[PDB]
Structure formats: structure tokens, C-alpha cells
Design a protein around this ligand. Structure first.
Ligand SMILES: *[C@@H]1O[C@H](CO)[C@@H](O)[C@H](O)[C@H]1NC(C)=O
Length: 402
């Protein structure tokens, strides 16, 4: 039997329903998503880190000419400064006053700490939603991880569960993101091969172990001081450091819909966004006839207490006269009231207690119970505290009138 019902995509809050037919007893169904995960399809564009400016030892020729011998290292600068007269701890290096030459060259390379202190620049394409759910059908219970795509089923005990596509496809990650120190940032980093100096991406590598290294650090050499041996260089300050100094708070403190953000895998969890269109294919063999189950006759309902509140502040007693003692389900076919409990136990004729949370100030709802239903009605009072530390349990509704 094919049944389908939208389930609000809230983490920690439960959801209940009853599936029934003209000659088959109510079969309860309960769902509880303990963690809804939003993994995006992601690939690595590069990794960046602090640079370090390596530099070959100056090659000094005493009154002889030199040449800018080229090598091919990242962001290389090579220059042949003439008219030098260097000094060491032992005195003047050369005897010719003029015509001495010093060839000096400098280059960029990855910091020694880049293997463990680096930022990963990624592109995030599309979303994949998977949720850890607790599903019960007529006391057949399962705890699973369902891939929310409408395709992948979870088929334990013969009932086939399919969690349709997340109704409002949405991600907190833009197309192009960055990971650093276990925090995910939305940042339009330069494409590989366009990194500009003094900003994020000044040095880049396709992988942490990649041989290639593009560097654009605005490296330019200056002539050394007379009587000193060294390689002067003025360079744009490390763009990665500047990004660290100047960056907005991570998505874990700015993401919409209250999403939590985690980094392995890159993902967002507990996004209170949209709803999951669950579809349940219940086998014909799991249904039970109305005759077998406890049948209720001549029930009455009364709200012995009502506190219009986020939690289950509403209490109602049902006086029952059952045909045979046992257990059976209880529900409200309406968004007015959401029940804490799924089923109750009955002993011939007596009373039972139902907990619920409500939106209506003047509540009235049909409590469906054990192959019957009773019209519960009453007046309800406001709650105590202005602010509470948990999310809503009761479906909001327009009617809150006198
Ligand atoms: C779901 O099942 C798991 C089983 O480990 C349990 O720990 C968790 O509390 C259950 N959640 C609810 C309230 O259904």
C-alpha cells in the first residue's frame, strides 16, 4: 500500500501519523530525524599557505663580469649588481675597487609548515542530503541513514521508505568556498593562475604535495648596501596572513537557517529548511483487521489543563469504554495540536491521558483514537516565559481569535 506524507525537516523533533482503511485497524507510523546532513559535491582547486622567500647565496666575482644565469623557480628574480665591494668577517672580499660583480637571485616557495597549516580552496557544485532517521511502523522499528534523493530506499522489514528530494533545494555554500582550521568560508578566491599579490591565493598549489607552485608575490630586488653581502628584496606581505587578519566569521556563525558547519566531509547539518516528502510502501501483510485490535466505544474528552506553549503544555483526559483491554494508537488529523505520545493502554472502561502542544488560543480538535474519534474542545491560557530554549513542537495556524 502506497502512502505519502510530508515530514518537516527539523532535527530532534518527532513526527507521527496513522494509516487506516475501512476494514483495517490503525497502523501507527513514527519518524524522528536525529541529524539531517547537507553534503555538497566538492572538488579541490588548490591549497595556499604562507610563503617563504628562498634566495641563492650571492655569487661574487672580483673585477669580472657575470651573467643572469636563468633557472625556472616560482616568481624568480635574478639581477647582476655591478660596482660592489663586499666585506666579510675577515675583511674585504675583493681587491679591485670597481668592476666587482654580485649576481643575486630570489624566489618563492611553500612554507615549511604548509604541510599542516594551509587553506584549501574548493568549488562546491551540487547538494546531497542524507539524514539519520528513527522509523517505526506498528512496533517494527529501525534506525538507519536514508539518502534523501527520492531514489535510494531503505527496505527493512518489508516496508519501503523513500525520502523524496528536499522540497526547497538550497545550500549555505556558494559555488566557491575555502576551508581553514576546521572552518568553512565563502570567498571568491582567484582562479588557479590568476592569483594577485598581497591577497588570498598569492601562492597556490594544485595539491599539498604537488610539484608545481605558481607564485605572484611582486618580488623585486634592490641593490645591496656597500660593504655588505646579502640579497635585498621587497615583497608584498603574505596574502594568506592578510586573509587571516581580515576575514568575516565562518559559515558556522553566519549560515542561514541555523545550519551547523563541519569540515570532514565539508557539510552543513541541522538546517531547519523546507520539508522531506516521505513516501512509505507498506506491505499488505502488515495491516491488521479492525476486529482484532481494541475497539473503542462511547468516548468523551476534556482538556483538564491547557498551556499554549512551545512544549507539550496541554493535557487532556479521554474517558473510554473499550471492548477489550490492550494498547492502541492516538492522533490528531489536523495541524491544530501535536501529540507527545503515539499510543496508549486501555483497561475496559476508564480514563487515559494525552499530552499535546497547541497553537489555538481557543483549541478544538478531533482526537482520533482506536477506531474512533472524539471532539476535544476547550479554552487555553498563555505560557509563563517569554523566551524558551527549544524549538516549536506545534504547527502554527492562523486562528488565534477570541
Ligand atoms: C533514535 O534511535 C537512537 C538509537 O541509538 C537513539 O539513541 C535516539 O535517542 C533515538 N531518537 C529518538 C528520540 O527517537
Amino acid at each position: 500500500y502506497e502512502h505519502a506524507t510530508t515530514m518537516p525537516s527539523q532535527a530532534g523533533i518527532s513526527y507521527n501519523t496513522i494509516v487506516n482503511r475501512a476494514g483495517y485497524a490503525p497502523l501507527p507510523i513514527s519518524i524522528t530525524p536525529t541529524k539531517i546532513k547537507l553534503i555538497p559535491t566538492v572538488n579541490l582547486e588548490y591549497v595556499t599557505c604562507h610563503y617563504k622567500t628562498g634566495m641563492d647565496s650571492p655569487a661574487i666575482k672580483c673585477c669580472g663580469s657575470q651573467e643572469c644565469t636563468p633557472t625556472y623557480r616560482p616568481d624568480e628574480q635574478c639581477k647582476v649588481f655591478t660596482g660592489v665591494y663586499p666585506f666579510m668577517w675577515g675583511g674585504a672580499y675583493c681587491f679591485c675597487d670597481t668592476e666587482n660583480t654580485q649576481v643575486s637571485k630570489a624566489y618563492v616557495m611553500k612554507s615549511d609548515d604548509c604541510l599542516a597549516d594551509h587553506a584549501e580552496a574548493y568549488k562546491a557544485h551540487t547538494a546531497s542530503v542524507q539524514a539519520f532517521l528513527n522509523i517505526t511502523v506498528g512496533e517494527h522499528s529501525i534506525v538507519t541513514t536514508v539518502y534523501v534523493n527520492g531514489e535510494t530506499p531503505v527496505n527493512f522489514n518489508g516496508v519501503k521508505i523513500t525520502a523524496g528530494p528536499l522540497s526547497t533545494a538550497w545550500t549555505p555554500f556558494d559555488r566557491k568556498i575555502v576551508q581553514y582550521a576546521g572552518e568553512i568560508y565563502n570567498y571568491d578566491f582567484p582562479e588557479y593562475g590568476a592569483g594577485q599579490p598581497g591577497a588570498f591565493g598569492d601562492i597556490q598549489s594544485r595539491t599539498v604535495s604537488s610539484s608545481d607552485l605558481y607564485a605572484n608575490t611582486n618580488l623585486v630586488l634592490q641593490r645591496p648596501k656597500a660593504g655588505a653581502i646579502h640579497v635585498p628584496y621587497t615583497q608584498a606581505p603574505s596574502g594568506f596572513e592578510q586573509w587571516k587578519k581580515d576575514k568575516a566569521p565562518s559559515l558556522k556563525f553566519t549560515a542561514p537557517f541555523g545550519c551547523e558547519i563541519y569540515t570532514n566531509p565539508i557539510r552543513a547539518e541541522n538546517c531547519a529548511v523546507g520539508s522531506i516528502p516521505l513516501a512509505f510502501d507498506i506491505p499488505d501483510a502488515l495491516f491488521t483487521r479492525v476486529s482484532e485490535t481494541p475497539t473503542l466505544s462511547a468516548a468523551e474528552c476534556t482538556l483538564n489543563e491547557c498551556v499554549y506553549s512551545s512544549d507539550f503544555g496541554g493535557i487532556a483526559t479521554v474517558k473510554y469504554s473499550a471492548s477489550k483491554s490492550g494498547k492502541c494508537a492516538v492522533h490528531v488529523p489536523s495541524g491544530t495540536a501535536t501529540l507527545k505520545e503515539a499510543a496508549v493502554e486501555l483497561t475496559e472502561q476508564g480514563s487515559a491521558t494525552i499530552h499535546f502542544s497547541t497553537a489555538n488560543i481557543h483549541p478544538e480538535f478531533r482526537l482520533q483514537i482506536c477506531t474512533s474519534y472524539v471532539t476535544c474542545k476547550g479554552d487555553c491560557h498563555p505560557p509563563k516565559d517569554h523566551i524558551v530554549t527549544h524549538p516549536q513542537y506545534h504547527a502554527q495556524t492562523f486562528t488565534a481569535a477570541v
